[PDB]
Amino acid sequence: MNIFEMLRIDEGLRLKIYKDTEGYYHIGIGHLLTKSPSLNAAKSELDKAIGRNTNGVITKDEAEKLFNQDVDAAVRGILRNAKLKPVYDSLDAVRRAALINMVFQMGETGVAGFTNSLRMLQQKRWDEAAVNLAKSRWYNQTPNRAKRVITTFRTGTWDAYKNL
Ligand SMILES: [Cl-]
Ligand SMILES: [Cl-]
Ligand SMILES: [Cl-]
Ligand SMILES: [Cl-]
Ligand SMILES: [Cl-]
Ligand code: NA
Ligand code: NA
Ligand code: NA
């Protein structure tokens, strides 16, 4: 298991434009196209992202290219952020993946807003952090995914992603 496989489980893979669980246009492995309700706006975004005039459908290699960029961007979001970088630095590589997962789903600014959660993670108070992380819009709206990420923080193991 690693961050790529983890996010492939949590996000799925679709080769045509789809709406994610927020109702926003996406493609591939959880690649956000736009928060606009306009499908045409989403398709322009897609063409811009791929570099060609698509028909709203990409190949698996193209989806994996965007995914590889998006994972890279979630780390960039963490390492450039004064709140996220010290927590990441402090974590083992398995818990690092859980933090990348959150930033992939919610973005840098949103995960930086988990001030109290981040403090408990930096303190290595894993059960307390897990309780605090669940008191969120994130957990209520995507509970099974948040439970997997939270178990990863709580235990420092991949147990929530094995059998899947
Ligand atoms: Cl992009
Ligand atoms: Cl940086
Ligand atoms: Cl910052
Ligand atoms: Cl709490
Ligand atoms: Cl879920
Ligand atoms: Na998905
Ligand atoms: Na629409
Ligand atoms: Na995403």
TrEMBL record:
Instruction: Recall the GO molecular function terms of this protein's record.
Output: lysozyme activity
Instruction: State what this protein does.
Output: Endolysin with lysozyme activity that degrades host peptidoglycans and participates with the holin and spanin proteins in the sequential events which lead to the programmed host cell lysis releasing the mature viral particles. Once the holin has permeabilized the host cell membrane, the endolysin can reach the periplasm and break down the peptidoglycan layer.
Catalytic residues? E11, D20
Q: What is this protein called?
A: Endolysin
User: TM segments?
Assistant: none
The record lists the catalysed reaction(s) as: Hydrolysis of (1->4)-beta-linkages between N-acetylmuramic acid and N-acetyl-D-glucosamine residues in a peptidoglycan and between N-acetyl-D-glucosamine residues in chitodextrins
Classification via InterPro entries:
Endolysin_T4_type, Glyco_hydro_24, Lysozyme-like_dom_sf, Lysozyme_dom_sf, Phage_lysozyme-like, T4-type_lysozyme
Subcellular location per the Swiss-Prot or TrEMBL entry:
Host cytoplasm
Q: Which UniProt keywords apply?
A: Antimicrobial, Bacteriolytic enzyme, Cytolysis, Glycosidase, Host cell lysis by virus, Host cytoplasm, Hydrolase, Viral release from host cell
- Give the family, as the similarity comment puts it: Belongs to the glycosyl hydrolase 24 family.
Taxonomic classification, please?
Viruses, Duplodnaviria, Heunggongvirae, Uroviricota, Caudoviricetes
Q: EC no.?
A: 3.2.1.17
Offer a single GO CC term for the protein: host cell cytoplasm
Any matching Pfam family:
Phage_lysozyme
Q: Known PANTHER family for this protein? A: T4-TYPE LYSOZYME 1-RELATED (PTHR37406)
